[model samples]
Target chain A: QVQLVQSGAEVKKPGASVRVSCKASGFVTDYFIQWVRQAPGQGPEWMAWINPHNGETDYAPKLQDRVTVTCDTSTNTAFMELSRLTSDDTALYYCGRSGRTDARRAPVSYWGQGALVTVSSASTKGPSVFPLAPGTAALGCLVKDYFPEPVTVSWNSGALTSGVHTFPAVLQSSGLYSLSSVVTVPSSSLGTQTYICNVNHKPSNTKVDKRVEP
Target chain B: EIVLTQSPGTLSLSPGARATLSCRASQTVRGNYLAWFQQKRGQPPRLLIYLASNRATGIPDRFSGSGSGTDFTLTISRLEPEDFAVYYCQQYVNTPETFGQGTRVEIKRTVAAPSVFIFPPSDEQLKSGTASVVCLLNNFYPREAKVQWKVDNALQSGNSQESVTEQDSKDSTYSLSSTLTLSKADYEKHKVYACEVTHQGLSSPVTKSFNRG
Candidate 1:
């Protein structure tokens, strides 16, 4: 039942800049927003993305130099800006809710209504601690402490198994708790494993997992 | 600058084994069209599905796609070893021609190491036990790619292996190795043989052929 409702069409002059929005409903606003584009008779391209809650953004190599993405958790919304528009920039723009890597594969499950941005002209202005790359295994838990330490961290994979590996900690960034883990697998064994991150700070525990090959 | 990645360089499924191919768009692309492609040895890439759920004309009904907006999945029911090859997904709903990294298909624990050389036997050479054959994949994306053996227009049995490894250039790229070891008996049986490499989203399988030269 999660959904992303996006903004309307925009017509801008060459060299002009414009911004588009995708508002969230049903899901928490803390999730990430990813932008994509499709040109006439060609394939869709990954543009850029933003985590509304953290104000962090990542861009594709081709787009890293041009596009900017930002989000505001308070409003449960994400925004994309196109700068110094040209004819090449014309296309349908879409925003989708980003899902963490999970047993289900990291797929964008929810999408927003598209907004057409005609960039005639415009200007625009623009992971964690022990960042885990894909397909790694871990022997110990990743625990985060509160106070001088920004927040706590935790882990959960489906039906929790006690002591297999326990990551217990607290996270209080922007009044929210977040947790993460890094797991590794052997080199010859790629594409045959799954790992999960469970973050708990209050009413409910957030859980997600991603598959990997060693 | 949206980037898409595929893991497990290779996948192994039983004949009719249910399989899933996953793709992640680096950023949110709203209203973008998602599509999957299938490739076989010596054939062009055939379109499978588009816009996330619509199937291409003439595609087998066993292939299906689901998910929305950014995340998506392509599932195949009843996986055949022949169905083993490279599969890729492309999003045309937007721009820059984006594609998922690619997944190679092969039997599990049976992947062969990449070939270091190929020896094309001459007519006189084939008459002796000195004749040999090899297949090479120099520049490619999907790791653990598919390799095929064709003898006298028929696919050879039990003559192939799979290998996945990475090579570094100015940028990061993937390479696959499939070495087909032929015996003197089989070499003498067929006038010509071919090694096929299938890549997703390609209109045709990239193939190379050899004969007693």
Candidate 2:
């Protein structure tokens, strides 16, 4: 199962700048990250993209000059920062994997939990994960309780450490076992290693990962 | 003003390897209409979806759309042999419905690839005098290309446009053209006029545009 867990709410004063992060845990974050914006009543707007494999970014012409999207492949996380915030910048932001290839990304497949950010002159309380630390990571994995439907995991480094890493257990809808493994490597290794997490269920499979740094 | 793009004009898929398509809008297309189309070899375009989620009149459940807003996805749950063809998505909520460049879906087989090229007529500015505009095409497959003239981005009838074809190419590629006459007053309007071309085995249509008085 591939999932994107985003950082919490963000509150910024007019003219201030804010950066939000969307972290991928279940599958390889090596694909592409598409930053989408949802105003009060509008549909999603394609802001830009940050290719995890290569830190390159592409923005819609309208957003080319106003928004920036960056990713840390090692951490399986994508960051979107609004440089000059105005009242118009208030809205919900989401980051999701760009389906492979340029021609097929319609109706986004995997999506992140949306983060709400408000931009105004009055002081406001943002989500729990604002001004998040650089080293923080999200792990989308299966726990050991449901090992009958054992899960599989992989990392871009081509492998994961062969050790029992304990995690809090949880149940999922698919009747498959689920667990999460969160580890922090050197800020450098974050860029060099592949942080892969997989959930193996019989007759089917799902996996996600990110490149490691160092 | 939303336009989608598909890279790697062609794709070959192996069994079990997920086949993915990416659709991108030029601007924020929130609440706008988005639908996918499938055109197999020697067949008319089929509607896959409209407004993103609602499947067209009759479509297999295997086809699903997930993303909303600028980024979107259209996936084939399992790529069967017959699924080999072109896939495209268009936004209808806005004028000048735009499509991705084009993607050719093929299985592991050697096939004849048709050449397709489209060109729209050029317009004359209205500053000095009245002028007529004519679009031309070359090295294209006539049987596969549908050419049409549009004013202000909407399809136009036989008001002031005419189409003609010339078959003279070394590779059997046909050449075609469309002509539109405009007055100085029309040129001054600066409305976006366009020519659209549709072809088989191609994901989306191609369009060329210019301004007129």
Candidate 3:
């Protein structure tokens, strides 16, 4: 019955810093809290984690320098700070509860709702889509050059196709989003089916559609 | 960080059979930070062994773990019905912890039931005012069975001991023996002692009684 509630969305300018908080309830506050990042339409990535009991922290090698994680046991809240923020730091952040009671074998078993953040002040750019053939029967859609955070990408073939979809997106130094989504189709049905990639950014009323015949 | 690899991806064995699962680490894992887990379908993994060879809380003594450094083993001396699941090994000695892929143990059909025998003390031995009765369990497939002793229809304690199992390499059957020592007064008063054997192959316990002659 553990629960975690995250802070609301934030909009910041370049070089500014933002601190996100997650309040925990229905459980002991001394457990470890892990922060996760999801850039645009990509899958969640592990950032850093903190043990609130002793304030010990473990950060991913790639994000160790830019991220700082802290906890306030008095208020039952954990905080993550991103310093010298750029558009690359614009993403949805979530706090997760470690599965292990101790810090040694902690994996995320519970998660807080995401809090979105944007760090750009320029006009949004719609994404460009292209079809990719990773294998003989697999079709992937590559979407690049989008602005701001929060985008949804899906694949369709007349109706929604049943396949594995992986969205891995990155925030560029130019304050844009670049990502890709891949879908696999059966080789036998490729000639008879059509695949479509749909990208949507609700804030900017931006929608882009691209189709491919496998 | 050391990576662990488990061998014999799947084991198809029957209840009472012996199973030896192995986990090999790519490098040395120190401080006994390796642990084993059992996972069933639709359920969270249960910790089996931790700190190398030590059994976790509430785990049966039959499920023993051993080994250190780069080679570790989880041996179930006798498989149980609920043991038909996947097992994984994880190492916490280093950062970015890693787990072995998994080893699955599946259930197979039972083979044979054990034959029970009770040997009463000879007259010459009984004259010494002290005697011992032996219960032999032989020729059981799957090798899992238990023997209980009773005197005059009541449970007897601290008077019996069991032996390590002996396996027949040809057919993979097993045999074991238990002995019950008795004081002269108790043996003469009770006059009747029984050995009850239970195994997965039998629908009910097989009992054998011996009378003091």
Ranking by lDDT: 3, 2, 1
What residue runs in model 3 are displaced by over 4 Å at the alpha carbon?
A5-20, A28-30, A34-67, A73-75, A82-124, A129-142, A147-151, A155-158, A162-197, A202-205, A209-214, B1-31, B34-67, B70-213
Error of 2 at A106 (Å): 5.2
TM-score of each: 0.34, 0.34, 0.39
- Pick out the ten consecutive residues of candidate 2 chain B with the lowest summed lDDT: B116-125
Which runs of model 1 end up more than 4 angstroms from their true locations? Answer: A100-105, A120-214, B1-61, B64-213
Query: Candidate 3 residues B64-123, lDDT tens each?
Result: 889998999999999987787788887754654566878878665457787666766544
Which residues of candidate 2, in runs, are more than 4 Å off?
Answer: A101-107, A125-214, B3-213
Q: For model 3, state the Cα shift of residue B71 in Å.
A: 5.1
Estimate, for each residue in A96-208, the C-alpha lDDT of model 2 and write its tens digit.
Answer: 66555344444444567567776655422111100101143322222222422224444334355532132322222322233433333345555455555434333233233
Candidate 1, residue A190: Cα displacement in angstroms equals 68
Instruction: Compose the digit string of candidate 1's lDDT tens values, residues B44-94.
Output: 345687667878767788889887766778888877655666777766544
Clashing pairs in model 3, backbone N/Cα/C closer than 3 A: B16-B142
- lDDT for each residue of candidate 1 in A1-214, tens digit (9 for 90 to 100): 6767878766576787778888878873446567877543334556876655556666766666667887776787778888877868777787876544222213344566577664433222101222232222232222222111122234334443422222222222222222223332344433443444543322122222323212
Candidate 3: residue B91 Cα off by (Å) = 5.4
